[PDB]
Symmetry: C4
Subunit: 367 residues, 4 copies
């Protein structure tokens, strides 16, 4: 009676937006909480945006408050703008993860800048657990939904002061309580900003290598925490920044591998890849289907240019949990759309897209 | 246990407003979402306004945002003003239709400008289906409630680049999923802006001919999609624009037939007709009873001038679904009231009127 | 299972405020709906303010809208300020009455200025009945809660163009549907602004005589509509305007009998009387207990000066319906408190007071 | 089926913030209700801030209203800012107490300045009881949650015109109705601002001595109202103002004993103490663990500096009531954080911290 994915993932032949971002910019209404590190996650009924607040607007500018350095996590329904009257403060935190197990929300937040850093866990309204940095901190949560299968919830936690040598662990939770953890062998790479989905009792995640790779590393693991980390084997890297296309291999792409941005790869057969339109700008977003999976040479069948000119940012998976018509498990993603404002710089608003089995035209969503 | 109309339609001897529009103009409060292509539709408990947002007010003017060209459908309870805190974003879309089958909302939206145009369907929160333009697009939904009978939902979809030769289809849906469609034979006419109701297991609709008619074409069909299209046989055309009264016949009225505006005809015996007060202005709204039905010569018995001077616009049917006192099926309509503002031009607000069996005075609702 | 009063009314030895009015003036927040002809009425769970809107504030002034002459009834929870986000539009109307029968709300509104005047009735969300003026109009509802006993709801409806010769009827409703009505014999008086309560299967009401009396006429009737109209027999009139104390008798007090303001008398033994502090100003509010009932000579035992200086206005009864601790039926009243504003003249806000069996000090509620 | 504490209190090895205060200052949004004498209390599902309103913001300043001297109690969910749209007016009052017994809220408020002073009690929405000052008034409620065990609710009520000789009583309530009261023998001390928790069918409270003590007096009592009042036996006083450390004894600390501020002591073994960082300023907040209990010499094991520089104020206990994971009873506290504003002086916002059994780093929560 706890939640678990439907037995098979739906075929995906295209992606339709279920929500464009609230279309702010160059102006925006007062009383809006401005957000970063937002992601979406759903209960059995509807979906919510989870986010770190960093400011509140009024007259086109930021209210001078302490919101930027006193970081707290908030929640807002997907269908509502993020105002004070409509958003709820959940916990203090600078990064986070959240997921509904069918019964209650499990919410994790990290606080503290270095060795003082620690993670708190909430189950429903009740704080149920804590743990500390083990490798110098700061502890870092993914800013994407954690993954629940039949009452067990899994999240990737990062540690270490440098991308030089980060440490990453899978924590397994029940009732908001750590049952165990496994340290991953990630020698030679960096694996931040994990975004994940579940199917076939497995959990799959796409990382961001901020150290030495413009391709995105992939993690796959079971509920017993047996795992593998693999590299995409095409020659089209998907991080930003990145370099140009190279010949397909299983090697990392190290040209411009430094830095990066949260993003995802649908690790199925067919596999889908996603990235900005060009390598020179954070503009547009392109989804490409690879029939033979991400460990093939990468031959692209379908290719959708969902955004062409609009500046874009982080993206990640989320899964609908209470579908009643689909016999199969749907997959969706959230994506930051970036808008310039007149009075408070650049802002991020989430759009959401879901996979559908039926094909569709290459519509540009800029307008 | 799915919804179906009560067995007989209530006698209608007059129309009372159940909601005047929010009385904005020349001024209006900040944080209001300004709307177009609004209509109402109800669940088993209360009623909602569905609409395409095109702007957000502040200090009497439009916030410069991207709301106008990034079109999304929203929903607000009938009894509330359409503010950010109270309205919910449902789906991206430039035209739409919505209807509650007794269990969940079925919502359709159309997006794309020409051959890229396509329709998405939502059942509850779950996107359940899509289909594309077949005749060049854009696909166009009615902007009025779709019609559900015992779990099957019906809506009219228009296609084609010109009113010159539009194509129109009835789509039949279950669980937000297309079961079939039938193309209508509409050679020689144009049938947009369909607004519909159901009674006696039938569905009846009034169209707007934007090509060659100032009378409104009428569609009647069964759940097996057997249908007929008939022309009103009076000599008093009800579109706007239109020309003067002519001698009653079953011919179309082609004087000023070009263009038009969504509107309705209650296709019963007696039939009710509805139109602006005069042919020269979009002012007032007049409801006229024709005892012998719309295919008679049109002799008018009752005649109510609900608005005299106030500028008016689109209108359409909606049906209450959870009446518990009435033994019979009530019928209502929504109507745009147009208000001039000081700082953002002309706006539309919906009023709603319902039929009652008891007669009433010819009150003018301007004030 | 329909609602009915508890078998006996609680002893009342004093009155405590359960809500002061929102303390606006000289300033008030923007987005507030300004109200008149407000009263309170309760479901089985909590209580609501019902009111006619006449404006919306912004920057201390009235938004220039059409709200004043397009009158609509709204509802707001007692514990909330009356903003757009929190208030609900119910029906168009210039006067009204409302009452919950245990199952649904029955709501009546009157619209139209003279012979066109008519009343509409809502049961839950469903309009269930209408009737017209019979004596020239306008039809007038009390602006206080109607009274429901075991599924039958009663309200006083006034008619006629002059206080010179008004006509008053009791309408009996079930499911928002008129079952019958009885015209009262009110020759020689005027009986507007009825405010009522129920106990012992009876319904009792206090009127306002706008024609020839500064005492308040009292109506008492049964569910079979057998009734009596009696005059208070003290010499202390309670209308405003009024003249000074006179010697106790059953005669009307005609000095300054012209005009008046809605108000109440608790018609029990002991009886309670209520009025402004002095006859020269609408200031303060005084409640006086008369052990021998309102048809005695009026000897006053308890006397509470609840307000001394604050300007006050209309007042009326309401009854809590879902008490679970009290074995007896409580009685409360609402009272307008008048506040001067800097930018939109004088406003009215409701306070609510309830009777308690325990005595209490003569606290002044001005501050 | 009424609420009672879990059988044992959880071990507490540290304190984590479950909510930082809304980070206002130097600026804050309009439409905010500014509050004082706030505390938190929970139902079986979530938690609420209870508070006395004293103003409403707009454009960085206080709206000139009557809110400051017409004092009313309000309630807001912990996770929401305290705006008009989101806060609910409960009762008029200048001090208060509230507690959920598992079924309904019991709410007490005090009104009146001296001998007219009295207390009103609400059970759910129903006013159920009243009583008057017995020793000259004003009656004073604690401004912290009252305590419910199995349907009986207990609160400390203070009386008397001077801290010179205040009188304090325990009132026992059921269904919002006083069953009895016991006067405490508090000769030689003053015991205001009681903040309390329950465990082991006992109720424990920490007072504030505004007369002659910089240590905090402690009250412990049973449901039969057998009680004891004891003095902390360390030499580190916790009131503010206070003097420096002295040698441990059971004597009161009278240096700077005059005045004080609401605050708490966790009266267990180990005991926790809490106070500002230094004696010279109301800055920071420090929690210190005393393994041997508050009646020992006070040897400190753990010591957490939760705030260092930030100005702080009142603090008190609250208990979560609907935990489902913890087998034991959790304990939390609320704490005022003080922020300077540009346009309305100094404000107070509540943060909440809960005890956890796992240890944690000495993180500074200033930023
Ligand atoms: C931990 O993972 C690292 C990285 O994958 C493993 O090191 C690699 O081992 C293979 C041989 O099987 C080499 O071809 C790679 O070049 C190695 N990479 C580096 C940088 O060492 C390592 O073997 C794993 N350790 C354990 C204990 O299994
Ligand atoms: C499709 O509908 C059209 C329009 O009603 C039909 O054409 C009409 O047919 C009648 C004869 O029955 C003529 O009197 C009209 O003048 C025709 N209109 C035009 C412009 O052609 C047509 O027959 C229908 N087609 C089919 C296959 O049934
Ligand atoms: C209707 O009510 C009026 C007013 O009470 C009645 O008229 C009064 O009758 C009594 C005699 O019983 C006189 O003493 C009053 O002076 C009368 N008032 C006036 C102005 O007429 C009248 O009798 C009632 N009519 C009916 C049919 O019962
Ligand atoms: C009421 O409490 C007071 C204060 O605790 C008691 O007075 C104290 O009694 C002890 C002796 O047992 C003395 O050592 C203290 O110095 C006393 N304090 C003062 C100021 O009197 C008092 O005995 C209690 N009264 C009753 C009736 O029990
Ligand atoms: C906000 O306030 C602080 C002073 O209290 C200041 O450091 C900062 O510069 C202010 N922000 C702006 C934009 O002036
Ligand atoms: C869709 O509707 C049909 C109605 O016949 C119903 O039987 C079925 O449960 C619905 N689909 C699913 C799989 O829920
Ligand atoms: C809104 O912004 C864009 C520039 O970014 C501009 O094209 C448009 O004119 C602006 N609107 C107004 C009213 O100036
Ligand atoms: C109206 O009220 C009566 C009460 O006697 C009840 O029996 C009936 O169900 C109600 N009307 C309908 C048709 O629901
Ligand atoms: C409101 O608008 C109308 C003009 O459209 C005008 O008659 C009225 O004077 C205006 N109100 C004020 C206060 O100017
Ligand atoms: C008040 O509480 C008691 C608990 O013993 C309960 O029995 C009773 O039902 C409550 N009072 C009433 C009349 O509801
Ligand atoms: C608020 O209003 C009253 C006058 O009605 C005045 O006493 C007080 O000074 C005003 N407040 C301010 C800040 O001027
Ligand atoms: C935690 O989850 C387990 C699932 O196996 C469940 O049995 C248990 O009830 C939960 N914990 C508690 C004490 O509620
Ligand atoms: Ca990289
Ligand atoms: Ca036309
Ligand atoms: Ca009078
Ligand atoms: Ca002190
Ligand atoms: Zn920080
Ligand atoms: Zn946002
Ligand atoms: Zn290939
Ligand atoms: Zn567009
Ligand atoms: Zn609107
Ligand atoms: Zn005829
Ligand atoms: Zn009017
Ligand atoms: Zn108000
Ligand atoms: Zn007497
Ligand atoms: Zn006061
Ligand atoms: Zn606040
Ligand atoms: Zn020791």
């Amino acid at each position: 009676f706890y939640w678990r994915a439907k037995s098979q993932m739906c075929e995906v032949k295209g992606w339709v937006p279920t929500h464009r971002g609230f279309p702010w910019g160059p102006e925006l209404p007062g009383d809006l909480i401005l957000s970063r590190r937002a992601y979406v996650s759903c209960d059995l009924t509807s979906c919510f945006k989870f986010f770190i607040a960093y400011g509140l607007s009024a007259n086109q500018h930021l209210l001078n408050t302490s919101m930027e350095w006193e970081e707290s996590l908030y929640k807002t329904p997907i269908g509502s703008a993020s105002t004070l009257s409509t958003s709820e403060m959940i916990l203090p935190g600078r990064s986070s993860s959240a997921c509904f197990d069918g019964l209650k929300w499990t919410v994790l937040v990290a606080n503290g800048r270095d060795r003082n850093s620690f993670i708190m866990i909430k189950y429903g309204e009740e704080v149920t657990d804590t743990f500390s940095a083990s490798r110098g901190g700061p502890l870092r949560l993914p800013n994407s939904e954690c993954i629940c299968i039949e009452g067990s919830c899994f999240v990737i936690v990062s540690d270490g002061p440098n991308v030089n040598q980060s440490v990453h662990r899978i924590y397994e939770l029940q009732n908001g309580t750590v049952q165990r953890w496994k340290q991953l062998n990630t020698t030679g790479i960096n694996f931040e900003y994990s975004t994940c989905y579940t199917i076939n009792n497995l959990i799959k995640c796409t990382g961001t290598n901020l150290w030495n790779d413009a391709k995105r590393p992939l993690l796959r693991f079971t509920k017993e925490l047996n795992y593998q980390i693999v590299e995409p084997c095409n020659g089209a890297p998907t991080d930003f920044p990145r370099g140009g296309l190279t010949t397909p291999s299983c090697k990392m792409a190290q040209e411009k591998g430094e830095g990066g941005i949260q993003g995802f790869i649908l690790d199925e057969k067919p596999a889908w890849t996603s990235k900005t339109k060009a390598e020179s700008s954070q503009n547009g977003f392109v989804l490409e289907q690879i029939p033979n999976g991400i460990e093939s040479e990468g031959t692209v069948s379908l290719s959708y240019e969902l955004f062409s000119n609009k500046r874009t940012g982080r993206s990640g998976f989320f899964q609908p949990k209470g579908d009643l018509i689909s016999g199969c498990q749907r997959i969706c993603f959230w994506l930051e759309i970036e808008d310039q404002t007149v009075g408070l710089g650049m802002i991020q608003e989430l759009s959401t897209f879901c996979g559908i089995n039926s094909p569709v035209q290459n519509i540009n969503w800029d307008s």
